């Protein structure tokens, strides 16, 4: 959607038990819906007082550690779990496997509004960071950086540049600051054109199969593996409707009885972990929401990428 007037950088946030289960088909890094919902909660909690609109998040992931283990004699992995409390009779509860992962992400938030003028930049950057320190990012606590060498501060970069050279200069100054990670974007045009190529190969192909084809490592006869352009991960790129839209006080056991509920289902798209200096404009690579609620199709992506 709308272009960011400024670009706020939350620095390397340490998340201790984030949801490794992104979706029913994918594990690993949490979904970009987690980060877009976090930035909407930041807007909902501090942005309505600074008179700004925090919209769009760029995900960087400097460090990732999944609490997984590879069992003996097995090629695949399983999840290390937590020991829940007992039942009221003293027995062990039924184990529900959740994946936990220790992240270190830095978020680029699109900030636009009239509160950029009314307040200093470091003030609203400090306020969204002191509000983010009491929050959680994929189900995991944001570790608030006590007693290391120095605390990582913020920088709200005003994207309005007086010159294009100064704009490229401070895009470089921000990219150098969020460099040891890998920015996560959405490549759904690549998924569709790979589906088109797979359909010229074999007819009646689904883009679930094209997504899988971009996921695998295919061995080819003369032996060589089929190379890929980038990292090309599967991500859950939103939700698709299963039920019609139910009224607020009509569905049973909702979160609130003032919001319309609709049973949805994941929509697995394609992602691409690329380094942040391959984009040449950091005002791209920000993940927004796209609802279109009359059809279903509640989804997130990063438009204006290419």
């Amino acid at each position: 959607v709308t272009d960011p007037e400024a670009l706020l950088l939350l620095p390397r946030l340490s998340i201790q038990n984030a949801n490794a289960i992104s979706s029913p088909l994918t594990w690993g890094f949490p979904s970009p819906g987690a980060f877009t919902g976090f930035v909407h909660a930041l807007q909902r909690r501090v942005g309505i007082s600074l008179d700004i609109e925090l919209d769009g998040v760029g995900i960087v992931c400097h460090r990732f550690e999944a609490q997984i283990s590879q069992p003996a004699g097995k090629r695949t992995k399983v999840f290390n779990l937590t020991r829940n409390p007992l039942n009221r009779d003293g027995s062990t509860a039924a184990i529900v496997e959740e994946g936990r992962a220790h992240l270190e992400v830095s978020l680029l938030l699109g900030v636009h509004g009239d509160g950029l003028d009314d307040h200093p930049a470091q003030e609203i950057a400090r306020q969204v960071q002191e509000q983010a320190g009491a929050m959680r990012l994929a189900g995991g606590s944001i570790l608030p950086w006590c007693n290391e060498r120095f605390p990582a501060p913020n920088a709200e970069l005003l994207m309005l540049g007086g010159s294009d050279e100064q704009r490229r200069k401070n895009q470089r100054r921000l990219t150098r600051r969020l460099l040891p990670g890998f920015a996560l974007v959405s490549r759904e045009a690549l998924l569709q054109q790979h589906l088109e190529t797979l359909r010229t190969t074999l007819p009646e192909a689904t883009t679930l199969d094209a997504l899988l084809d971009l996921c695998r490592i295919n061995f080819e006869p003369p032996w060589q593996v089929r190379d890929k352009p980038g990292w090309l991960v599967p991500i859950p790129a939103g939700y698709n409707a299963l039920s019609p839209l139910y009224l607020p006080g009509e569905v049973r056991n909702a979160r609130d009885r003032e919001t319309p509920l609709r049973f949805v289902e994941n929509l697995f798209g394609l992602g691409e972990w690329l380094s942040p200096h391959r984009v040449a404009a950091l005002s791209d690579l920000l993940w927004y929401h796209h609802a279109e609620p009359d059809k279903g199709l509640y989804r997130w992506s990063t438009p204006r990428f290419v």
Partner: protein
Amino acid sequence: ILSTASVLAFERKLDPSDALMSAGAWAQRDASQEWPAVTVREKSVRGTISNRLKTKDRDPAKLDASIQSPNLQTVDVANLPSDADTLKVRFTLRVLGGAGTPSACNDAAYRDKLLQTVATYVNDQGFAELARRYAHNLANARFLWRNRVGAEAVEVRINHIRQGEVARAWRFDALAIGLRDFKADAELDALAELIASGLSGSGHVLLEVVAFARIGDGQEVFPSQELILDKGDKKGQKSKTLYSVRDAAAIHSQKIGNALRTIDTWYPDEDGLGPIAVEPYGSVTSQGKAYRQPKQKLDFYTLLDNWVLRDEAPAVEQQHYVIANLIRGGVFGEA
């Protein structure tokens, strides 16, 4: 008619992190910022059978032939170095605040009544009995679980970390402060007032809890063990995996939180255990027994229904337990 909310969910206040354990020597605990981390390594064990025979395999031929085929395990082991007698266990604690506000509540009537009930509690008696006991379980190193049971001296240092630095620092003798008496102390009351001002306010209070335990040279430290189902085929199976964040042994954050919540001296059974952890249907995983059963009217659901729905406020002890569950978090709600 004020029915209960079908969705109730309280967030976790008192949110700790993974307790990083490192190692060095006592009487330079004040320079323990470059102490090397306790690393988790593998060692091989070979054991005989010691479990109970099942009255059909008690015959001497099968037993003697079963000690000739021993189980051979690779276990994870974390030890102090042979020139280090002190274990430094360090974590961070966020005391978030907004302790009675649920993260999810269906009924606006039940939500307003629960906020009215929590505010009636906080004005009548604030977070001063709860946070005193949370400050005790910080001050005595109960989060040192098996790392405390033979230590010559445990010493807990707690630093209120403000915007960039230590705003107020504490230092306790964790072995004088017992694991079963929630007494009074001036510095404990200051830490309790800080945890209270965190649990009351709209923002978080960040503490840095460091506990040094003088165990001995080269002795075993006991980090948290990982719940790994499906260890795999028995040949290369690692029978015990110890938790470590980044080549550095650690205690799980929920284990530290479980030690911090051990404030419940109010359960109706006799206190041969002393304090247990605050849980709905208060259930000790080591004892295998759930105190605060619903056959008595002393679990969290019956007390919260009586307090919020029909205004039968319990005693001050059971309402300490109720508000301690609201600080503890949980996903409540019927169908």
